[PDB]
Ligand binder design. Structure first.
Ligand code: HEM
Ligand code: HEM
Ligand SMILES: CC(C)N[C@@H](CSC[C@H](Cc1ccccc1)NC(=O)OC(C)(C)C)C(=O)NCc1cccnc1
Ligand SMILES: CC(C)N[C@@H](CSC[C@H](Cc1ccccc1)NC(=O)OC(C)(C)C)C(=O)NCc1cccnc1
Lengths: 462, 462
């Protein structure tokens, strides 16, 4: 059973039911379960996802050893979560030596250099986003942000990774738009993924029936799509695909054709719903904190007078904008948790850790700990002012994780989201509607997302 | 193992491999496997779908006992085929007493009476089909029949079962059109369904993970869609839904709300790809047999002079049209086989049949038997002339099965397909293109469908 393990080592936690372990306590979501545990049990605790032991840790020293010092030797991989098919070769899923080789063949894709190159592409779709917004702003109808930010996020994905150029909002039925919309963030508390936790032995079975968590058709579409573009650019700069094609010419072992496809898909999956979700959470805070929206709009006009177009350099110039983005990510860190599988009997910061345990960092709960954040629930961007940004522990605030396996798309994600904000706020202000949910409720599911979706009023600064 | 059963009873057949049984012999498809067996082995034979024994029978007496005389007592159900979820309640899947109750609450829906009522609806989409065809006939581009007949078939389904009215071809992106297109005939020789045959014990497992062969979203869409229409017509004639709603007012036990949904879905699944597939096979024969198309066009003009609109009565008037439809269904009976599970030790026409065996009628192969059809591969509509239609055994030619469990949608299916043909042939002629596959090859898969899809030239009789 292994349900005696934490009781032995002296670690506290909720008592597990047979077979289910502690999963019935997810009825209120990971976020509410994690805070409770931190409160009830202290700096460390333990629980069981079925029979799999999970050790939670909240001490910044312990957290650093795990994600940095002993990342290569001990805590290199994440927990498997379901049948993956050929997506086993995607960087975020791959393990150990395959992972290290993959992370290397793809890191130059995410340098500040290649990213400054991509700025003018992502900018062009700032414009598209505006026109589409004004069309809803010239017709005084409340607006669903995720719909319009999704269309933008999508637009940016297609171009920055394949060269394809569509305003998805107006071609909602373009093939390259349909498949991609199906690529939604996995709800790890829906019937299926729960069942996987009760029956992880079911995972092999499903794999032998080529059942996949990435719908077989979406993937089949993109593979040939990629294997077509591969053989249309070759032969006839500047997207993720080309960067990867260019890499399997001129670790090591180059990148396989199918390995290349899986990375294409993962970048899509990672960047789509996330970008659009964070952008929604930020407009929710700007509409319910009018000062902050006004202070930010003023800042944007000074750097970019005359609605001047944002550039890479003038984006990194804006401090309040960076403050606002970070404080949103504090209150809504959409990964919720960080996790590593401990692959060896180990002892770190004076605590034994037996093989196979899952080490977990409860990010959401640390972001709202009163022991590090005064008034943690209030939206106060000044926590991140260059005055106070020094009193913030990088192992307490980790919206992109930390260490060698942190978010590879971090710089890009922030740059994408900020370009969107600048062009939007150059043009509109955003006001609560009667139908706006104040104060926002987080979904009880396994996603950090709003219970009810965000709807606001949008007015032209003209 | 049970792999000794046929060897014992004195029945011949191919030797089964361990675990796989005879399935490796499906590499050429059910149709080619069935003919071979009939040839090699005679009037009866046996084989194993994994460990499940299947007895084939080709004697018309034996076939009648099975589908008619002993249908209620012995051969009431079909073989399960995969995880079905809530679609377990659909008539074609349900079993025994539930089946008999369902077949009864739905039979009045398929009377000649209700069907004559539906004629003017299905006719209106004959017109739509024309306009769309002429648009491709005024632009001399070869035409893919299944695309244009699919759009028609779809159009007819939506209206005859929910009142919805769209020209799907031009609204290819209407929600009510997207879901329905996913409802495609199951390929019982793709990786998944084969695996089910090797691991039928996997079926329970999949059911406990709410995995379904009817994609959970399509079904989720229609349920609420139906539960909306149910509560918009009620309260504010003339489709399958209303007929079923009217039935759960004024066997017995009425029809449950969820039972009603499953029938809605099955009619869609049954009528969509089938109608469009048969209609394609018929235009393939009319284009490669120009006499027959001309003789039929002449017949239509005499009954309906001046492109007069077809009616129920003038449709049943047309004999050559009926001949042509039937002879197509002979060469392409798209179910391929009929099957019943023997639920008891039984002895019929002097042959023992142990419990649990699957009794199978190899329709495709009987339709092409030289022992009943001279020149079986030739397309000769005169086999069905009212002169020779008496020399045809109803248990050899069974495109809709036979007995209490035969195709409930038969009259409707024929009437739909004939209305389509009349309106089309009143207006166009259909000629081979260079890119037409002559002679058509049947797919080696588990569907009766063309290897390559049918493309023809379409000319206005104007
Ligand atoms: C607001 C946007 C995003 C947020 C908040 C976010 C957050 C995270 C977090 C917390 C992790 C886990 C880090 C760890 O385990 O320590 C992660 C991993 C990852 N992210 Fe993101 N992410 C975002 C957008 C993106 C984008 C746009 C990409 C585009 C390529 C991307 C690619 C990845 C990859 C590939 C990994 C796994 C890396 C590895 O295992 O080596 N992410 N992300
Ligand atoms: C060209 C069109 C069609 C052909 C060739 C066809 C053929 C067949 C065949 C061979 C069977 C099995 C009969 C048996 O087991 O003896 C069947 C069953 C069935 N068909 Fe069709 N079919 C067609 C269209 C339709 C349509 C339009 C509907 C619309 C409602 C429909 C509804 C059903 C149902 C419900 C069953 C199962 C009945 C029961 O189990 O009681 N079919 N069909
Ligand atoms: C393979 C994929 C399905 N599983 C992850 C592996 S990476 C860790 C993720 C990151 C994440 C970030 C934001 C929102 C959701 C998830 N989940 C993580 O919280 O783990 C537990 C749920 C605690 C087990 C993946 O690759 N996701 C692609 C991606 C998405 C978003 C940002 N960056 C990358
Ligand atoms: C539940 C559904 C997935 N399975 C069938 C049960 S009915 C027997 C069918 C009929 C059929 C006709 C034409 C084309 C394909 C199938 N298959 C049959 O050949 O069985 C074996 C494959 C030999 C095992 C169902 O309900 N199909 C709805 C339907 C479709 C078409 C016509 N009428 C009804």
């Amino acid at each position: 059973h292994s349900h005696g393990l934490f009781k032995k080592l002296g670690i506290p936690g909720p008592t597990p039911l047979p077979f289910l372990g502690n999963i019935l306590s997810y009825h209120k979501g990971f976020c509410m379960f994690d805070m409770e545990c931190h409160k009830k049990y202290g700096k460390v605790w333990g629980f069981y996802d079925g029979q799999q032991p999970v050790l939670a840790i909240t001490d910044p020293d312990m957290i650093k050893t795990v994600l940095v010092k002993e990342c290569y030797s001990v805590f290199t991989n994440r927990r498997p979560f379901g049948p993956v098919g050929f997506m086993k070769s995607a960087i975020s899923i791959a393990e150990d030596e395959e992972w290290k080789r993959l992370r290397s063949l793809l890191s130059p894709t995410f340098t500040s250099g290649k990213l400054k190159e991509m700025v003018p592409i992502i900018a062009q779709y700032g414009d598209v986003l505006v026109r589409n917004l004004r069309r809803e702003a010239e017709t005084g109808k409340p607006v669903t942000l995720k719909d319009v930010f999704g269309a933008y996020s999508m637009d940016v994905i297609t171009s920055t990774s394949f060269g394809v150029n569509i305003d998805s909002l107006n071609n909602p039925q373009d093939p390259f738009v349909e498949n991609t919309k199906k690529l939604l963030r996995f709800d790890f508390l829906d019937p299926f993924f729960l069942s996987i936790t009760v029956f992880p032995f079911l995972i092999p079975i499903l794999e032998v029936l080529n059942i996949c968590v990435f719908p077989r058709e979406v993937t089949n579409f993109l593979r040939k799509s990629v294997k077509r573009m591969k053989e249309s650019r070759l032969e006839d700069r500047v997207d993720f695909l080309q960067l990867m094609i260019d890499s399997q010419n001129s670790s090591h072992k180059a990148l396989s054709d199918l390995e290349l496809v899986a990375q294409s898909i993962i970048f899509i999956f990672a960047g789509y719903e996330t970008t659009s979700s964070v952008l929604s959470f930020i407009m929710y805070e700007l509409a319910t904190h009018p000062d902050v929206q006004q202070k930010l709009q003023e800042e944007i006009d000074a750097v970019l007078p005359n609605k001047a177009p944002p550039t890479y350099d003038t984006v990194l110039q804006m401090e309040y904008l960076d403050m606002v983005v970070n404080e949103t990510l504090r209150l809504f860190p959409i990964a919720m948790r960080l996790e590593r599988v401990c692959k060896k009997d180990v002892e770190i910061n004076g605590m034994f850790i037996p093989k196979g345990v899952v080490v977990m960092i409860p990010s959401y709960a640390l972001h709202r700990d009163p022991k590090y954040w005064t008034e943690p629930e209030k939206f106060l961007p000044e926590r991140f002012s260059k005055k106070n940004k020094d009193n913030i522990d990088p192992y307490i605030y980790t919206p992109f994780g930390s260490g060698p396996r942190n978010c590879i798309g971090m710089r890009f994600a922030l740059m994408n989201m900020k370009l969107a904000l600048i062009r939007v706020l150059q043009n509109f202000s955003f006001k609560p509607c009667k139908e706006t949910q104040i104060p926002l409720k987080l979904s009880l599911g396994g996603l950090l997302q709003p219970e009810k979706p965000v709807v606001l009023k949008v007015e032209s600064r003209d």
